[PDB]
Amino acid sequence: YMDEDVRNTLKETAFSISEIPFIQEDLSNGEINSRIQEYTKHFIEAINDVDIIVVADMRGVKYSHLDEKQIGQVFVNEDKKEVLTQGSSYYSLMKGSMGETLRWFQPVMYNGKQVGFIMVGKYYNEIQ
Amino acid sequence: YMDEDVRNTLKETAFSISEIPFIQEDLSNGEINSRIQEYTKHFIEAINDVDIIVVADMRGVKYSHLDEKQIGQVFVNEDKKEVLTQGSSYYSLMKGSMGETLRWFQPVMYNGKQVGFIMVGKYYN
Amino acid sequence: YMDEDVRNTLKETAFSISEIPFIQEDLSNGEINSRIQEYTKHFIEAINDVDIIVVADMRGVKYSHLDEKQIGQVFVNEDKKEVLTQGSSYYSLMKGSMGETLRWFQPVMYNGKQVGFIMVGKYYNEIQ
Amino acid sequence: YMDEDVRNTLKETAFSISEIPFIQEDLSNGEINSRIQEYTKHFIEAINDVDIIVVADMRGVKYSHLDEKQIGQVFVNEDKKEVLTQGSSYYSLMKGSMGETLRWFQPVMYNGKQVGFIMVGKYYNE
Amino acid sequence: DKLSYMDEDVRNTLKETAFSISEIPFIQEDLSNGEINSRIQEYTKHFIEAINDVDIIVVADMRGVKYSHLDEKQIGQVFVNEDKKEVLTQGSSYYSLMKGSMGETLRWFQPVMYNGKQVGFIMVGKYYN
Amino acid sequence: DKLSYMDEDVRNTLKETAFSISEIPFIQEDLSNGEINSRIQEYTKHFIEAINDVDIIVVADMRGVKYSHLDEKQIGQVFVNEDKKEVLTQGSSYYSLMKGSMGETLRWFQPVMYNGKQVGFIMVGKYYN
Numbered sequence A, C: 001y002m003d004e005d006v007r008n009t010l011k012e013t014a015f016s017i018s019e020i021p022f023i024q025e026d027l028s029n030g031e032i033n034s035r036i037q038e039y040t041k042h043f044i045e046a047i048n049d050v051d052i053i054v055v056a057d058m059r060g061v062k063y064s065h066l067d068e069k070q071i072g073q074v075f076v077n078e079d080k081k082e083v084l085t086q087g088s089s090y091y092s093l094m095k096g097s098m099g100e101t102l103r104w105f106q107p108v109m110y111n112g113k114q115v116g117f118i119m120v121g122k123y124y125n126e127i128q
Numbered sequence B: 001y002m003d004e005d006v007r008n009t010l011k012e013t014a015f016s017i018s019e020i021p022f023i024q025e026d027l028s029n030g031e032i033n034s035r036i037q038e039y040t041k042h043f044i045e046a047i048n049d050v051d052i053i054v055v056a057d058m059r060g061v062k063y064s065h066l067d068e069k070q071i072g073q074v075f076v077n078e079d080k081k082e083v084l085t086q087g088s089s090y091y092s093l094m095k096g097s098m099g100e101t102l103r104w105f106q107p108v109m110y111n112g113k114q115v116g117f118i119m120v121g122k123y124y125n
Numbered sequence D: 001y002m003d004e005d006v007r008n009t010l011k012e013t014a015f016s017i018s019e020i021p022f023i024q025e026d027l028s029n030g031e032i033n034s035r036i037q038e039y040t041k042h043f044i045e046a047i048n049d050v051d052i053i054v055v056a057d058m059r060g061v062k063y064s065h066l067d068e069k070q071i072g073q074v075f076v077n078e079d080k081k082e083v084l085t086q087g088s089s090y091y092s093l094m095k096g097s098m099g100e101t102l103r104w105f106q107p108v109m110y111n112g113k114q115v116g117f118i119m120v121g122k123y124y125n126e
Numbered sequence E, F: 001d002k003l004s005y006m007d008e009d010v011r012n013t014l015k016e017t018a019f020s021i022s023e024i025p026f027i028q029e030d031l032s033n034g035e036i037n038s039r040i041q042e043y044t045k046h047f048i049e050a051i052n053d054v055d056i057i058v059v060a061d062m063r064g065v066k067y068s069h070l071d072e073k074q075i076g077q078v079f080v081n082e083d084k085k086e087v088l089t090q091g092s093s094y095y096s097l098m099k100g101s102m103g104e105t106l107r108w109f110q111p112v113m114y115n116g117k118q119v120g121f122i123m124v125g126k127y128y129n
């Protein structure tokens, strides 16, 4: 399902954030501010279709928040059978991950110049 | 080989947590406790090689924490080039993920019976 | 000074918040959510020209944040001379306040119906 | 006249804080301490009749906290009718404020000398 | 000929601190109500942190200790100093029953009143090695 | 004929708890570094809260007690019970010196190692009236 509701939510969310004056200034400045970091947490919490939010400046990811329960399952689901059925302790390398993730990338501008980008996404473990 | 320092850290960390009385009782009880949830956060924060920590009871994942910066990059890395270089907006569907993640599974026991497990892992490219 | 920079900041800020899906749902629902409450705090902190932010539903003010230092002075300034110069303890009635405060009112809509409003303002103790 | 219950609460509250050793030392020192700042927040939260609390040294206001819902209404009340009834957007300049606010000023002393004061108040519409 | 000692500075700090807290309206209501409030609990922490001579603060209602805070470094040493020798000088690991402390602790007890009736008390103290 | 008593459940809980904490990488690094970290401080609080038999937890470096947490209700009573009587029954404000303490406290000491060298210790205990 790549329904428009989701597509829309992702775009509006990313856009809204991209238009915030202080978000723009922050990316420009390069200074790390934990309150901005915290600011992104609201979107994961209050918007069901947003499982991941990333705010990056031109150097890279600066702030980031994820739906910890949702994303956590991604890294567990596979190869959990052994420990659960025996009481066996072991190592397991997981190459890549299961499922798919829909993302929307939105650049961020300040005083006419691009200072970074914002990515917003939803995770899918099934398909339909 | 596969760096023993890391392998060690993962195992000790998971073991340590497995041996905590209240962690054992909690998994047995089935009740959800936010302080336990918070307890796991210390390991991500204070241990560099721990990017993911999961605590599950026999039903499934109960508590969980991730290094949000680390894991966030997983979902970005691929297809970030365009927006960064040409300043354009778009959708991009990512099937699975790039890189690899080393995990260690540790069962959890209470009064002789297994009540769940703990997974601890590090992400790589 | 009723310069456009300020006027603009107030309007954008209020508009931005009015367009947030979860802000709309929250006012509709009537449930009190402390994370929304906290959400408004970012605007006071990060935007210099915003000294006050109020979010009200149709019953009244629901969430609110103020620049505590800025607004605090309003209630002190007057009649502080005595205690400061003598060591006199006393009561003093102040009606109402000094200075002026520029505000912008923005309604909030959800599914086509108005569910409340948002007020954003800046305080002035002088004039120019 | 007023209401003595309130008058009393304001006075006790201010007095209590005045008598705290660390509050006295802090005003004397001039150093800014966020834990003291936080200390004042309890009074707004836990005491219904306290809408404003200010702690000032001889230079001026140093720490301060307000009942954000209470004080917020002051700045709204007056010109809210329009947006609420006709759903329209606009600017509105408010000269001063409506209502009245009862305050109590209490000096603060350290080693015999006055180092500041504490103001505690309640806001009223009528 | 004996010689006792009396530091009034400390004695005064303890009394003013306890009194101050006793006079707080919300402290009184809280003890009356019986409800547990973590913000009150936190409120007591300021006194340990900001007042050097206050190593212990206890707030009790008529049932018993309700809120409490201690200077963790100061009080911690009490439980170590005595049987810390072994672990510290190649012990290493062991069990030990300690009775009593030792050292001495000066306390001041202050009752708490609400609407004319006593609803509890406040104890404030300093520890001496 | 005397009769000692030995509750292994408790003895066990204390030892596993202390051991567990000793084995935490960041606990080891922290003691080595000497820097004070409030999150570590907070980390120790979980054990008091969630483990009934743990009334005291102390984490010390080679200099001394660094972090510490106590079951504030439990330990508070220690400092009250003895000269609690007068304030609770009569008036009644006063000063009181308590020499040492009543009751007994079972502790377990566990050293802490980092990169082969001992950087401190952890003490875990339960109080008995």
Ligand SMILES: [Cl-]
Residues within 6 Å of the ligand: A077, A078, A079, A080, A081, A082
């Ligand atoms: Cl499997």
Ligand SMILES: [Cl-]
Residues within 6 Å of the ligand: B077, B078, B079, B080, B081, B082
């Ligand atoms: Cl790419």
Ligand SMILES: [Cl-]
Residues within 6 Å of the ligand: C077, C078, C079, C080, C081, C082
């Ligand atoms: Cl004046």
Ligand SMILES: [Zn+2]
Residues within 6 Å of the ligand: A038, A039, A042, C038, C039, C042
């Ligand atoms: Zn926030």
Ligand SMILES: [Zn+2]
Residues within 6 Å of the ligand: B038, B039, B042, F042, F043, F046
């Ligand atoms: Zn914690």
Ligand SMILES: [Zn+2]
Residues within 6 Å of the ligand: D038, D039, D042, E042, E043, E046
């Ligand atoms: Zn506080």
